[PDB]
């Protein structure tokens, strides 16, 4: 709590008292210098107490401001910070089904409705390109979410049913992508 004009006087009084005790001055002079000390010290301590209270108030205000700022930051970017955490934990799990469906959704092969879990399952998927179609479908079987689904219906983007044999490498441009595939659990 130095750097104040009172602390300099207090330190000079301390030095004077030290010199007096070194010289071993008389009890009257000793008392006089001891009281000069005590008054200078009594001033510096009061000033330093004022400084300390001012500093504690400033620190409390600063930490309250930091609380406000960080709370506002946390609330502002709450939507994207949750998605980032979600996908980080999804990668951490590194499950076969979750990874497979996320990769499919990367190419756009999203599911229209929730993926069922029972044998009597109704799964509808969108297949926006022939590359993903051939990658995911081979004949009358379908691979998705680490599960095998039997192709029941394959309807084009204009609601027209397509015969399975029609979809070929040379017939890909003819169809109006995306496709919609309805299948059951195998």
């Amino acid at each position: 709590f130095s750097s104040l004009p009172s602390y300099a006087a207090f330190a000079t009084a301390q030095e004077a008292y030290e010199q007096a005790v070194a010289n071993g001055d008389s009890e009257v002079v000793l008392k006089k210098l001891k009281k000069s000390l005590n008054v200078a010290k009594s001033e510096f301590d009061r000033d330093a107490a004022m400084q300390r209270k001012l500093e504690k108030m400033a620190d409390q205000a600063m930490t309250q401001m930091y609380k406000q700022a960080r709370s506002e930051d946390k609330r502002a970017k709450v939507t994207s910070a949750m998605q980032t955490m979600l996908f980080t934990m999804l990668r951490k799990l590194d499950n076969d089904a979750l990874n497979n469906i996320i990769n499919n959704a990367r190419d756009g092969c999203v599911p229209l409705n929730i993926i069922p879990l029972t044998t009597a399952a109704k799964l509808m998927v969108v297949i926006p390109d022939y590359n993903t179609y051939k990658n995911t479908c081979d004949g009358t079987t379908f691979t998705y979410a680490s599960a095998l689904w039997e192709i029941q219906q394959v309807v084009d983007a204009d609601s027209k049913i397509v015969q399975l044999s029609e979809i070929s490498m040379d017939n890909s441009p003819n169809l109006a992508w995306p496709l919609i595939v309805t299948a059951l659990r195998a």
């Binding site: 500093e55 504690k56 620190d59 600063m62 930490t63 930091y66 609380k67 700022a69 960080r70 709370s71 946390k74 609330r75 709450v78 955490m85």
Partner: protein, 926 residues
């Protein structure tokens, strides 16, 4: 043996297959209620004197008709002959046949009876009152031998439970008719033996399941025109079954039969005093005490509790749309308002406001408060509602569209989970695992939780027993100082809380506690002391972490009722909270050695202690109306010097109209509470403690009266039960000289520690094994037949050793540890709870550790005791919390330094990540 059978069935053309072994008495083990000079109580007695004989019809089979052919001495035989000869005409009696047959060399009189069921009404009440699934074959036989339910229904999981399957109720109702028959035939018996000059005591164990009375050994002849049946021991042990089986269900039908249309009571009929009196004179004609249909005319709290126990049985007959506030058209400044100038309570009968101010002049703040609090104009201006999600009567819908409220999933603290998994937690095979999450619910959350009131059946309770249990329960509350206080003496913790509907539309409780000065509050409190103010109570949805996905709705009771209930009960409640060492430990901290003090208090010189405890399955909703009313009465026994009888009755009426059965607003629509305490009233915790003590005392009474009494080798206990029976079913007025004796007996052999539904008991184990004090089976039975819920082996427990301590109390486990050179009891919580609290939070800002460090300081304060747990991971939880607090402080310092070129000044915070700061929370010094 052929001759004996022929003599028994000589007159009757029916066949007879001997159940006994050749004219030998059959072993009979039933529930004979008994009161001799050397024995008392209502217990299972091995009386082997009858010779059961069954009747065979064509296509030989055994119907439920037996000839109870017992033997009596010649004098008793002659007395039975004379008594029966004066009761032959009455049809509510068994057709006795008295015969004289020689057995070896002398004529032992072979008295006999005809067309008597195997079980009596005593067995029916005993099996439904003392019901343990370990041994409940009598209830099975009763429910299967009278077509109440098919036998295979007993293979269901939790068939007996009133919560797992409400269908059990439908089974019990099948008995009601039989009861309502034997509940009427008894009156005929009474009438007959009042006009035949016969005086005696009517006992359940002398009545078979079709109403016939088959025992006249305890009757003497007064002159004809006089005669008094004593039914206090009959109508009181049979009382709780009359609502369990809904005996008076054939009363809502014209001609009172089950094959005719329900009576169409005119909607405007609100006063049913005449019908109540007719029902009382029909079924309970000879009840010796004065029954007041309206309880506003009752004498004292023990009378408001007697005639209210009958209004819970007679009010199951009247239509459910006749109760609730009674509306009258007052005129203010000319405009006609509609206001509640009364209330037709399901228990307290019809209550009319003393000062109905029709043709008023002007409305000031208090007048507007009383008019806006009551649902008069809320349900008078509101679309008719038929919400079919709930099985609870729906009054009206205030808004034009229903409101659906969903429960959010609860944020996730990724930082703390990363820290914990980096410190070795959250692994496979670890004992400490996450089991507390913020569950989420669909839009039917609030209504689906409110629908749990369907467990709140209308329960009539044994009255001669409750009128004594209430005295003992007040003895437990005899050490407090309570009364009425002025508006300036009321202490309210949070004024920043909801005021309830409709007051939450304009402000918080602060705006209604400060706007109306003390004078208006005292005027409103003196208004409730002579008027009934109905109110609406929202059912708010609670967002809290739990290991179960229950919604946990809470009643946001209105301000107009909370203010007055506080002004009424505040002194008593504060006196309950501020006293240490009592049975009720509300207000006693668990820190600074408080837990050890409590544990040593519960052990206050119990001879052979080892604890048990319990948690009511669903206390708020399953609680009966009679027990809540009794709790509100014994908490008003402290006003003997400040409030008259009328004022205290009107306060009870206000409490019933505002808490017990008040129409709640569960999402913009007014419904009707079946009953039970609302978990938002000014006396919820203390009323729950009162109810818990009442259940414990009832268990003690049933365990001491259901003992045989011949095998009790403790003379003092034998006489204690012999006088307990007298004080219950023979004495009428409070017997303090014995109430205090039994209270001392309980507090000696049955210690308690009550905090709402949390109960810890340190019963004298050897007596409980003997049967002289309430075991846990007794408490289960009491809850089953009084509180109409079944308590399974998930709320109960029993610790045979004191050193370990209670298995759980307030969800805090107890452990004996060496701290301070003396063994002390430390409460450690569930580690999964602490980890869940750390990982999952309510607000998104709580997931940033630096902002909320005090959260973890408090959580470590609560989790410190685990440090002494033998399991290493349990202490690792606390050490992890300390390390994470240090990490949060380091991150905060770094963030402050980076964002601002100023270092964090002062380092008093080094205590929080050092264990010394948290051991000081369990040192008994402070």
């Amino acid at each position: 043996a052929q001759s004996f059978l022929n003599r028994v069935c000589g007159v009757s053309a029916a066949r007879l297959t001997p159940c006994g072994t050749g004219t030998s008495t059959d072993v009979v083990y039933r529930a004979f209620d008994i009161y001799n000079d050397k024995v008392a109580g209502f217990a299972k007695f091995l009386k082997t004197n009858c010779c059961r004989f069954q009747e065979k019809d064509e296509d030989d089979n055994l119907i439920d008709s037996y000839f109870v052919v017992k033997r009596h001495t010649f004098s008793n035989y002659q007395h039975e002959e004379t008594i029966y000869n004066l009761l032959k005409d009455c049809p509510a009696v068994a057709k006795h046949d008295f015969f004289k047959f020689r057995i070896d060399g002398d004529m032992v009189p072979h008295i006999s009876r005809q067309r008597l069921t195997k079980y009596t009404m005593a067995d029916l009440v005993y099996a439904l009152r003392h019901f343990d699934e370990g041994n409940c074959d009598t209830l099975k036989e009763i429910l299967v031998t009278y077509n109440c339910c098919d036998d295979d229904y007993f293979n269901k999981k939790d068939w007996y439970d009133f919560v797992e399957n409400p269908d059990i109720l439908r089974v019990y109702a099948n008995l009601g008719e039989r009861v309502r028959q034997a509940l009427l035939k008894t009156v005929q018996f009474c009438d007959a033996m009042r006009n035949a000059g016969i005086v005696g005591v009517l006992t359940l164990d002398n009545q078979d399941l079709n109403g016939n009375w088959y025992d006249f050994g305890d009757f003497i002849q007064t002159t004809p025109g006089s005669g008094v049946p004593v039914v206090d021991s009959y109508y009181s042990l049979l009382m709780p079954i009359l609502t369990l089986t809904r005996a008076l269900t054939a009363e809502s039908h014209v001609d009172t039969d089950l094959t005719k249309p329900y009576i169409k009571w005119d909607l405007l009929k609100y006063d049913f005093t005449e019908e109540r009196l007719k029902l009382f004179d029909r079924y309970f004609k000879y009840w010796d005490q004065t029954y007041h249909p309206n309880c506003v005319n009752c004498l004292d709290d023990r009378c408001i509790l007697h005639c209210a126990n009958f209004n819970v049985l007679f009010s199951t007959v009247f239509p459910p749309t006749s109760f609730g506030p009674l509306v009258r058209k007052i005129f203010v400044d000319g405009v006609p308002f509609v206001v509640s100038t009364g209330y037709h309570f399901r228990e307290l009968g019809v209550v009319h406001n003393q000062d109905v101010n029709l043709h008023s002049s002007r409305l000031s703040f208090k007048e507007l408060l009383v008019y806006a609090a009551d649902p008069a104009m809320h349900a008078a201006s509101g679309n008719l509602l038929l919400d079919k999600r709930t099985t609870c009567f729906s009054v009206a819908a205030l808004t034009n569209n229903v409101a659906f409220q969903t429960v959010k999933p609860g944020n996730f603290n990724k930082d703390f989970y990363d820290f914990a998994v980096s410190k070795g937690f959250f692994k496979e095979g670890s004992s400490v695992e996450l089991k507390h999450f913020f569950f989420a619910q669909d839009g039917n959350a609030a209504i689906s939780d409110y629908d749990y009131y369907r467990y709140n059946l209308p329960t009539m309770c044994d009255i001669r027993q409750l009128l004594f249990v209430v005295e003992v329960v007040d003895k437990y509350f005899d050490c407090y100082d309570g009364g009425c206080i002025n508006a300036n003496q009321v202490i309210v913790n949070n004024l920043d809380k909801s005021a309830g509907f409709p007051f939450n539309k304009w402000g918080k409780a602060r705006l209604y506690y400060d706007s109306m000065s003390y004078e208006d509050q005292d005027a409103l409190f003196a208004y409730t002391k002579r008027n009934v103010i109905p109110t609406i109570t929202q059912m708010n949805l609670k967002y809290a972490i739990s290991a179960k996905n229950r919604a946990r709705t809470v009643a946001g009771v209105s301000i107009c009722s909370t203010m007055t209930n506080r002004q009424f009960h505040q002194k008593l409640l504060k006196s309950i909270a501020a006293t240490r060492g009592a049975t009720v430990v509300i207000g006693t901290s668990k820190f600074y050695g408080g837990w050890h003090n409590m544990l040593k208090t519960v052990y206050s010189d119990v001879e052979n202690p080892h604890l048990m405890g319990w948690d009511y399955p669903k206390c708020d909703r399953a609680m009966p109306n009679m027990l809540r009313i009794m709790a509100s009465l014994v908490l008003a026994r402290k006003h003997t010097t400040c409030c008259s009888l009328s004022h205290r009755f009107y306060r009870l009426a206000n409490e019933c109209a505002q808490v017990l059965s008040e129409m709640v607003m569960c999402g913009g629509s007014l419904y009707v509470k079946p009953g039970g305490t609302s978990s938002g009233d000014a006396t919820t915790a203390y009323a729950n403690s009162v109810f818990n003590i009442c259940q414990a005392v009832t268990a003690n009474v049933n365990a001491l009266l259901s003992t045989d009494g011949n095998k009790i080798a403790d003379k003092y206990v034998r006489n204690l039960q012999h006088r307990l029976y007298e004080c219950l079913y023979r004495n009428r007025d409070v017997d303090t000289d014995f109430v205090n004796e039994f209270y001392a007996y309980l507090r000696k052999h049955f210690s308690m520690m009550i905090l709402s539904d949390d109960a810890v008991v340190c019963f004298n184990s050897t007596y409980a094994s003997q049967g002289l004090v309430a075991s846990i089976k007794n408490f289960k039975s009491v809850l089953y037949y009084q509180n109409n819920v079944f308590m399974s082996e998930a709320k109960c427990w029993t610790e045979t050793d004191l050193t370990k301590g209670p298995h759980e109390f307030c969800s805090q486990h107890t452990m004996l540890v060496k701290q301070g050179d003396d063994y002390v009891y430390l409460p450690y919580p569930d580690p999964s709870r602490i980890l869940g609290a750390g990982c999952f939070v309510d607000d998104i800002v709580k997931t940033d550790g630096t902002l909320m460090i005090e959260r973890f300081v408090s959580l470590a304060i609560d989790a410190y005791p685990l440090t002494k747990h033998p399991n290493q991971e349990y202490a690792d939880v606390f050490h992890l919390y300390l390390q994470y607090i240090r990490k949060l402080h380091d991150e905060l310092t770094g963030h402050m330094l980076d964002m601002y070129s100023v270092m964090l000044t002062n380092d008093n915070t080094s205590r929080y990540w050092e264990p010394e700061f948290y051991e000081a929370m369990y040192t008994p010094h402070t």
